[PDB]
Design an enzyme around this catalytic site. Structure first.
Site, PDB file in Angstrom:
ATOM      1  N   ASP A  25       0.846  -1.200   0.000  1.00  0.00           N
ATOM      2  CA  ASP A  25       0.000   0.000   0.000  1.00  0.00           C
ATOM      3  C   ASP A  25       0.881   1.250   0.000  1.00  0.00           C
ATOM      4  OD1 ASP A  25      -1.897   1.978   0.331  1.00  0.00           O
ATOM      5  OD2 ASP A  25      -2.897   1.006   2.034  1.00  0.00           O
ATOM      6  N   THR A  26       1.211   1.747  -1.193  1.00  0.00           N
ATOM      7  CA  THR A  26       2.089   2.908  -1.288  1.00  0.00           C
ATOM      8  C   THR A  26       1.420   4.187  -0.792  1.00  0.00           C
ATOM      9  OG1 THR A  26       1.463   3.295  -3.606  1.00  0.00           O
ATOM     10  CG2 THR A  26       3.359   1.878  -3.189  1.00  0.00           C
ATOM     11  N   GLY A  27       0.094   4.207  -0.671  1.00  0.00           N
ATOM     12  CA  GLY A  27      -0.610   5.336  -0.099  1.00  0.00           C
ATOM     13  C   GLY A  27      -0.700   5.339   1.408  1.00  0.00           C
TER      14      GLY A  27
HETATM   15  C1  LIG Z   1      -7.019  -0.844   1.942  1.00  0.00           C
HETATM   16  C2  LIG Z   1      -6.592   0.623   2.062  1.00  0.00           C
HETATM   17  C3  LIG Z   1      -6.804   1.104   3.527  1.00  0.00           C
HETATM   18  C4  LIG Z   1      -7.446   1.462   1.089  1.00  0.00           C
HETATM   19  N1  LIG Z   1      -7.063   2.901   1.156  1.00  0.00           N
HETATM   20  C5  LIG Z   1      -5.877   3.343   0.354  1.00  0.00           C
HETATM   21  C6  LIG Z   1      -4.709   3.613   1.314  1.00  0.00           C
HETATM   22  O1  LIG Z   1      -3.529   3.742   0.605  1.00  0.00           O
HETATM   23  C7  LIG Z   1      -4.980   4.877   2.140  1.00  0.00           C
HETATM   24  C8  LIG Z   1      -4.965   6.136   1.282  1.00  0.00           C
HETATM   25  C9  LIG Z   1      -5.051   7.373   2.216  1.00  0.00           C
HETATM   26  C10 LIG Z   1      -3.793   8.263   2.413  1.00  0.00           C
HETATM   27  C11 LIG Z   1      -3.862   9.491   3.334  1.00  0.00           C
HETATM   28  C12 LIG Z   1      -5.184   9.834   4.059  1.00  0.00           C
HETATM   29  C13 LIG Z   1      -6.439   8.942   3.858  1.00  0.00           C
HETATM   30  C14 LIG Z   1      -6.370   7.712   2.934  1.00  0.00           C
HETATM   31  N2  LIG Z   1      -3.896   5.023   3.091  1.00  0.00           N
HETATM   32  C15 LIG Z   1      -4.078   4.795   4.543  1.00  0.00           C
HETATM   33  O2  LIG Z   1      -5.138   4.579   5.027  1.00  0.00           O
HETATM   34  O3  LIG Z   1      -2.880   4.867   5.313  1.00  0.00           O
HETATM   35  C16 LIG Z   1      -2.978   5.046   6.729  1.00  0.00           C
HETATM   36  C17 LIG Z   1      -1.755   4.152   7.392  1.00  0.00           C
HETATM   37  O4  LIG Z   1      -0.652   4.865   7.122  1.00  0.00           O
HETATM   38  C18 LIG Z   1      -1.121   6.355   7.202  1.00  0.00           C
HETATM   39  O5  LIG Z   1      -0.708   7.015   6.213  1.00  0.00           O
HETATM   40  C19 LIG Z   1      -1.997   7.526   5.344  1.00  0.00           C
HETATM   41  C20 LIG Z   1      -3.067   7.357   6.100  1.00  0.00           C
HETATM   42  C21 LIG Z   1      -2.708   6.293   7.104  1.00  0.00           C
HETATM   43  S1  LIG Z   1      -8.371   4.033   1.238  1.00  0.00           S
HETATM   44  O6  LIG Z   1      -7.890   5.408   1.168  1.00  0.00           O
HETATM   45  O7  LIG Z   1      -9.105   3.928   2.496  1.00  0.00           O
HETATM   46  C22 LIG Z   1      -9.495   3.644  -0.182  1.00  0.00           C
HETATM   47  C23 LIG Z   1     -10.810   2.910   0.122  1.00  0.00           C
HETATM   48  C24 LIG Z   1     -11.755   2.565  -1.028  1.00  0.00           C
HETATM   49  C25 LIG Z   1     -11.367   2.958  -2.451  1.00  0.00           C
HETATM   50  C26 LIG Z   1     -12.321   2.601  -3.627  1.00  0.00           C
HETATM   51  C27 LIG Z   1     -12.652   3.884  -4.394  1.00  0.00           C
HETATM   52  O8  LIG Z   1     -11.640   1.699  -4.427  1.00  0.00           O
HETATM   53  C28 LIG Z   1     -10.035   3.687  -2.756  1.00  0.00           C
HETATM   54  C29 LIG Z   1      -9.087   4.032  -1.608  1.00  0.00           C
END
Ligand SMILES: CC(C)CN(C[C@@H](O)[C@H](Cc1ccccc1)NC(=O)O[C@H]1CO[C@H]2OCC[C@H]21)S(=O)(=O)c1ccc([C@@H](C)O)cc1
EC number: 3.4.23.16
Lengths: 99, 99
Positions: A25-27
């Site tokens: 999970d690069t995000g």
């Molecule tokens: C399985 C993962 C959890 C899915 N997720 C992407 C992750 O990469 C999120 C992306 C992100 C980054 C910053 C703020 C909020 C969300 N990262 C994240 O939760 O990381 C946490 C830990 O580390 C910390 O750093 C960052 C925030 C903290 S999601 O976003 O919930 C998402 C849900 C449904 C959809 C449908 C459309 O397909 C698309 C995207």
């Protein structure tokens, strides 16, 4: 390896002596795993996602193996919908994005 | 290019004629963008992650340029804290994970 993205980048990880499936999970800044029992001490912490903030248990200096690549870092344990491997550990195994 | 993960993989994108910063996110199935008043038909949806769900609007066949690589696909628009480029578009720009 080179991992394409037409499917979820799921990998088997080894932590606390048990195997699990986790998402590369690069995000994610940090690594967050579903509720589990881990040895050692931990401290309460907060983490925010797309939907808000949750309470988690922060274990530091945890040995975790990801596709046979060893990492030692912080692992957060709490009510995440998915076991995610974040950048704190992706960097340790030499992961980059390329296009 | 090659993007290391010491810091958030933030890049510049172009959508609906506007430039924005967005996260190249292998952990996201689909692309979620900050609230913006895009034209065309949409349908409501709920998407979930750490902390719960948010309500978004699903637009189909939206063109996004990502570091000069054009892409067209589904985009969800709503109150996300960050713009998220998911695998639905990362595949189109030939993005891979490598370690
Ligand atoms: C399985 C993962 C959890 C899915 N997720 C992407 C992750 O990469 C999120 C992306 C992100 C980054 C910053 C703020 C909020 C969300 N990262 C994240 O939760 O990381 C946490 C830990 O580390 C910390 O750093 C960052 C925030 C903290 S999601 O976003 O919930 C998402 C849900 C449904 C959809 C449908 C459309 O397909 C698309 C995207």
């Amino acid at each position: 390896p080179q991992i394409t993205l037409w499917k979820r980048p799921l990998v088997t990880i080894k932590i606390g002596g048990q195997l699990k499936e986790a998402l590369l999970d690069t995000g994610a800044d940090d690594t967050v795993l579903e509720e589990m029992n881990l040895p050692g001490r931990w401290k309460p912490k907060m983490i925010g996602g797309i939907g808000g903030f949750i309470k988690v248990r922060q274990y530091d200096q945890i040995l975790i193996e990801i596709c046979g690549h060893k990492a030692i870092g912080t692992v957060l344990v709490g009510p995440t919908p998915v076991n995610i491997i974040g950048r704190n550990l992706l960097t340790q195994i030499g992961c980059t994005l390329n296009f």
